[PDB]
Scaffold this active site. Sequence first.
Site, PDB file in Angstrom:
ATOM      1  N   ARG A  49      11.553  70.066 -64.046  1.00 29.76           N
ATOM      2  CA  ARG A  49      11.811  68.341 -64.141  1.00 29.76           C
ATOM      3  C   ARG A  49      10.293  67.451 -64.537  1.00 29.76           C
ATOM      4  O   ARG A  49      10.900  66.293 -64.929  1.00 29.76           O
ATOM      5  CB  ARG A  49      11.523  68.224 -62.066  1.00 29.76           C
ATOM      6  CG  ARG A  49      12.318  66.725 -61.265  1.00 29.76           C
ATOM      7  CD  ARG A  49      13.465  66.448 -61.825  1.00 29.76           C
ATOM      8  NE  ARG A  49      14.519  67.429 -62.084  1.00 29.76           N
ATOM      9  CZ  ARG A  49      15.975  67.256 -61.584  1.00 29.76           C
ATOM     10  NH1 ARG A  49      16.135  66.095 -62.081  1.00 29.76           N
ATOM     11  NH2 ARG A  49      16.734  68.099 -61.434  1.00 29.76           N
TER      12      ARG A  49
ATOM     13  N   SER B 227      26.083  72.444 -53.732  1.00 33.33           N
ATOM     14  CA  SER B 227      25.050  71.230 -54.421  1.00 33.33           C
ATOM     15  C   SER B 227      24.837  71.928 -55.536  1.00 33.33           C
ATOM     16  O   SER B 227      23.782  73.376 -55.542  1.00 33.33           O
ATOM     17  CB  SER B 227      23.942  71.203 -53.903  1.00 33.33           C
ATOM     18  OG  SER B 227      24.293  70.037 -52.586  1.00 33.33           O
TER      19      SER B 227
ATOM     20  N   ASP C 299      25.702  59.915 -56.464  1.00 33.49           N
ATOM     21  CA  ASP C 299      24.540  58.956 -55.761  1.00 33.49           C
ATOM     22  C   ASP C 299      23.975  58.367 -57.218  1.00 33.49           C
ATOM     23  O   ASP C 299      23.677  56.678 -56.989  1.00 33.49           O
ATOM     24  CB  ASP C 299      22.946  60.483 -55.759  1.00 33.49           C
ATOM     25  CG  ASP C 299      23.586  61.413 -54.390  1.00 33.49           C
ATOM     26  OD1 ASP C 299      24.788  61.080 -53.803  1.00 33.49           O
ATOM     27  OD2 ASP C 299      22.805  61.510 -53.958  1.00 33.49           O
TER      28      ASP C 299
ATOM     29  N   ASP D 128      13.172  67.959 -55.171  1.00 35.80           N
ATOM     30  CA  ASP D 128      12.581  66.975 -57.164  1.00 35.80           C
ATOM     31  C   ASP D 128      11.855  66.185 -56.910  1.00 35.80           C
ATOM     32  O   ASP D 128      11.456  65.159 -57.408  1.00 35.80           O
ATOM     33  CB  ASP D 128      14.363  66.997 -57.118  1.00 35.80           C
ATOM     34  CG  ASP D 128      14.509  68.370 -58.370  1.00 35.80           C
ATOM     35  OD1 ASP D 128      13.776  69.052 -58.527  1.00 35.80           O
ATOM     36  OD2 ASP D 128      16.050  68.484 -58.108  1.00 35.80           O
TER      37      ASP D 128
END
Lengths: 393, 389, 398, 394
Positions: free
Chosen positions: A92, A175, A13, A121
């Site tokens: 994050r 994932s 990605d 996220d």
Amino acid sequence: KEKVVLAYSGGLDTSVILKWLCEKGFDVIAYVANVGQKDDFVAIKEKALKTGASKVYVEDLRREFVTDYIFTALLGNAMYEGRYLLGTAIARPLIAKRQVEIAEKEGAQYVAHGATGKGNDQVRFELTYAALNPNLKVISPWKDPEFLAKFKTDLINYAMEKGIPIKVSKKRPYSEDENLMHISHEAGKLEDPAHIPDEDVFTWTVSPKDAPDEETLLEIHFENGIPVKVVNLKDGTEKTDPLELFEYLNEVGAKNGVGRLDMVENRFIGIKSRGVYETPGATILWIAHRDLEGITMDKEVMHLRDMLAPKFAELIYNGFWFSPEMEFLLAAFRKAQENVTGKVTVSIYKGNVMPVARYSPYSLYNPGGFDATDSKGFINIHALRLKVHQLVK
Amino acid sequence: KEKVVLAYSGGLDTSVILKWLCEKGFDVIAYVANVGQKDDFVAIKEKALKTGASKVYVEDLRREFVTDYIFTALLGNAMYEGRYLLGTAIARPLIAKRQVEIAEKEGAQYVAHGATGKGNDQVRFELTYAALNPNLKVISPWKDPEFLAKFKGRTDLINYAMEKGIPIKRPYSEDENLMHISHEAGKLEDPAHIPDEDVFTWTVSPKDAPDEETLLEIHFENGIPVKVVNLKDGTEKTDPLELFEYLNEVGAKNGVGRLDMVENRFIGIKSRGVYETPGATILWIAHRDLEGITMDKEVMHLRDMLAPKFAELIYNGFWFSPEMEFLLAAFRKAQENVTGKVTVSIYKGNVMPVARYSPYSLYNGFDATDSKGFINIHALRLKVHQLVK
Amino acid sequence: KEKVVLAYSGGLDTSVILKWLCEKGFDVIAYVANVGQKDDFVAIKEKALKTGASKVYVEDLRREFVTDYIFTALLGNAMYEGRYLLGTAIARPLIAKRQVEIAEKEGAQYVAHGATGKGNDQVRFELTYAALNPNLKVISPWKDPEFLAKFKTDLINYAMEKGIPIKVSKKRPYSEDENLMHISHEAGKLEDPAHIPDEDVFTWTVSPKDAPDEETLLEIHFENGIPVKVVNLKDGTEKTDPLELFEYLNEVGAKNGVGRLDMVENRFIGIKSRGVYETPGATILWIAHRDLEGITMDKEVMHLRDMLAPKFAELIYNGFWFSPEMEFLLAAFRKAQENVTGKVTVSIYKGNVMPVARYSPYSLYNPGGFDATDSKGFINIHALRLKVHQLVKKGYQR
Amino acid sequence: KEKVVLAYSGGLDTSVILKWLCEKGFDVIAYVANVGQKDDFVAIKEKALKTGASKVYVEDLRREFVTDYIFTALLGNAMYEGRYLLGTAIARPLIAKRQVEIAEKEGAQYVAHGATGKGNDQVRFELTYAALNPNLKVISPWKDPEFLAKFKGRTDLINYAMEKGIPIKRPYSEDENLMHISHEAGKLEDPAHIPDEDVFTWTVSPKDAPDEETLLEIHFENGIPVKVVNLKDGTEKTDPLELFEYLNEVGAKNGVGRLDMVENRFIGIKSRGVYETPGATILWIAHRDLEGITMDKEVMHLRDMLAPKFAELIYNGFWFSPEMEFLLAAFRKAQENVTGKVTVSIYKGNVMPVARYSPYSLYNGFDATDSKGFINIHALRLKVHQLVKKGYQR
């Protein structure tokens, strides 16, 4: 001309996104945050450059992650929905904050990320950007109509087409996110909550079944709620540096089958999602921390803190780390940790983390004044209210 | 003439109290509650009668304890101070309520209990009396100056039993019922003292438990357990009492349910306890897992915010209070359609949910553009805070 | 000699206690706390000495009361059971704290008070004593079986025997407490909550009916949630000193019929009690402060604070001013007040305190960030969850 | 072919929308909700048919507004951000629910509304649609890119009306129903601007109100108002609609119910509003007074802790949500035996409880020795804390 700082992971990605922004005419700076993932940062930086980044920042954020993020969550024994220790959520905001600081250093007007258009996220990045510098413009390709049409195999085909290196072997069919606090596993076969995870889903911890049939005793020392020492009472190992001590807890935990969680959580964007999490070290620390609170914290303070603990965890999960309401709660939660100081002995054995002993200089047990008459009064006054209720309704 | 219903255990304290009340001229009805403890209730009945009781009630309250008390705590996943599953606190309001009902039946004007003068259980008795029938007069010898003058120590109790012809092991104070066994005091009183394996009497240690996992499927309807199936040996339990006892057996054999903690008391300050709660440990974990797939997020958040208060009310003895009624109204509502089944792996102390299913979930409607707006509206407020501060 | 510091009010109860503690052989220090009551402290001190006290401390606590107690309660807009501004409760911890400090300065072994054996003030005193200095021993004659037996007209008869002066005229037929923040009135005819208070119950505020048929406009300025200026926009009066400003709000309020409350409250010791309260100045300040919070405070902070504000008020009411749980809440509540800074204009007229304007340098209004497409997305994500609840309650419910 | 039920106000926006949907080929049913606004509903119904609606429903929802919405808010003394009595927010779920009911009845597959694209009302509509019938498709022209392109401003709306033969005062945006009138925007947008007396249109100013108090006795059963009596003039009402309107009359005549505040929005940030809520201001004050003599202290404490969340749910549009059901279960339980009467003095803006009575109170058993024990046990914990704050703090 225009600069963008892209949170770059090295995966398909963000590699496609990096190429794509270059193709649109942006000067892309690749920002690679080392929060303890077991990645080849040398290779990732090479890939960024081969993909078109003008400059790469590889930032070692592991110590800060531990002392200012994981240990901050620990102040509330933060657990989302009773269970989740928030490993991705705690990382994050640190990752986004540093991205903001790099953009300011570079005079970049844009920050970008490759979080998906339908997960959590993205919110954690973007709420942080908003809270720290609202003047930065945000690029999120997975919410960009053009990008979204182009990449509904479309990503791999574009990598091939544009000379982006691609992985030389098959990716695991889940994932997964990894940092010093946890590894998460979602999607694929896990998407069905009635599907039992096979052992190959797990990549850090051994299973309790495979863990050694021998107990390990640790002493974990705290000062005002912050871990300051881990001692292995079997082999003598002693760790005082916060990063090394936390890594050591991860090691002991993982070896001993500690920290597996399988649950369905409520997302902030979306409804529900099944996840499998491996949190070896923090599992140990959270349990030890709560145990010391038992002997140190005032009852009414604990009760109020526990009432607010779900909110604290929600704020972390949702991405409101850098919010006024989080600052409000932290003021109180930090106050509650004053004199949460002492040591806990935990027995660790095939997935179990069991407090067996604890000591604090700030407790009555550092080597009451009432009687049965006082109890009689205390009961009678509390009972009055209940009698009245009955004599009426 | 005046009747008293005494909560009678058969131990020394309550046998003494039975005699003492009889000597004061009370007609004493002895009430013996069976909540799952390992006692000889036939013996206790006979002792009561021989000691002076006009009548004895032996009440098998086990099924009610499970369906109306343990399963009620389960509604809030009740855990006091993070950890404690409240085995002693959940039984006492049941025992006290039945005592009140007997007094109403017998037209007795007094109820009495033998709980100690500086512990929590006396509060749980007396708040239930107050809440259910304030007209009943309460006798509590261990807070009575005359009784306390006369029985300054155990030797006084023992000598009195001998004088009055009253009939008649571990260095811990222990409470036992269908839900748990507790161990406190003695060497445990020092929280830095590691409990010897000998402290534990119900659960095997994880170390001694079988080296093979057990898989159970636990089924719920509106938050109430309705079936337990053993996936490897085929055992199925549907009766609530039998299913709960089965969870106890599976937990105990497999080392589940041990807790060592220091709790804040209601009367007193802090106490170190060791608790063994094998079946309820399993049930609470399974229940929370099903809630994950069934409960609305905002409901769960509010319920979790209020769960410490729910546990506090149970711990302190406010089971029958207006504020408990208020919370239960909401907590029961939250459990509507908490219906489905959870598969749990049970292995050497661990209880791990591995799979779950509900007919009332989307496992039995937006695009990325929407996320953009949701984020932007949420972010507004944060941008203002920054621009202004 | 055994030294006791007695909280001495000059009334019948504490004068008898003073005497009695003398008669039991104590060296008594009379401590008289001036928290704004309109009492003759010169006469009280003399009565103390006539009654037997060895020494008298008359402590002017009014400024501290405002800045460290009233203004602390203001941080939460504290209101107990939706209504009560806590005037008695806020004063008692300050009074008890100063008492502890005088016992410690004097090396007294005991502190004593004359609060009744069945009310709330006793708790406020004694929880403060426990929190600040557990080494002091506490004398509470109204919980002392001996003292209690003697004084079941019995107090007045003992005053006569011991030469203790008694009031030269009839006392008002209510139990009344007064300080800079409020006057309270309870008992007597007010005990029946269906009895409408007559106008003679009230002794500070004029009634709204009697107040001038003319509006007063004030500007009240705050910095970090603390009042720092009051300006009368009609007559130009300005006050910045915290004590002067608060006294001025009392004056304006009282003249304009502001601050009357008649309620039944749940006690901490006991069940329920009917009270009539007059709180002119704080009624104004509390309303003004909440209005400023409207333009300055973050929404989620306000929401959390308001969820916790009943607990904050409970803690004050119950006597837990100096508790760990209060320190926990105050850390957050003070944080919420950062940049509650600005000014509010209030119209004051016959009982009404109405914010009409406000300004803050720390707001978006100090002299576009979304669109209809954003709204659509925000709604759609919020709606998802509701769609699931419906397709669950619709079906067969087992 | 396809049917849409449009919430139709008769104003410019919803008249344009009605025509626009008709032109797109929908069979439009016009739903006209009477929640107490002072409109000519006969004229509105004629306009809808003239504009192309196939059928119009004019619904008198006033009594249901009182018994099932206003009285529900009353259960928690709902006040948003300390002050706001939620007049606009309480009416919208009712309006939206009846709209869904009409759609169900007509077999309509769409509902539409004309609320603006950056306000709160659109949320209240759409969360109610989602909660009650997610199968219904929702049309919101003010968030539709095509409609927004066409109607960039009022002039465009006006010209279209002229072009399509659609039939057809104050510098404030105003919402009016049986519970309140709100006034916002224009000059009020500046929170430092003092509102002119002319802003107010329902209540008289306290300055102009009669210089004589009115005494009302308001009776409740389980938290629900059941009777109002005027003690000086003998007026008595028991019907819930009549009683509520009577409180509105008494409040408005006597200058009761004005509020000027800045509130935090759900969509957006902050907004300054001026609200006139005469009857409900009275009712909320009376209700809280009765709770004083009837409600258990611990129930009251928990309810008050949760009251901000209850008000938030109402403000935000979550009237029909699971979390609202959760709170209502408890809040209703709290109201059991909130039964009695309260006498309030009403005088130039003031609503003051002066007396109350309940059959379910001790106004229809401990000693000093007990206080000593109660205090000593509570004090233990504070003594422990002191002996630990006095220490060296590491």
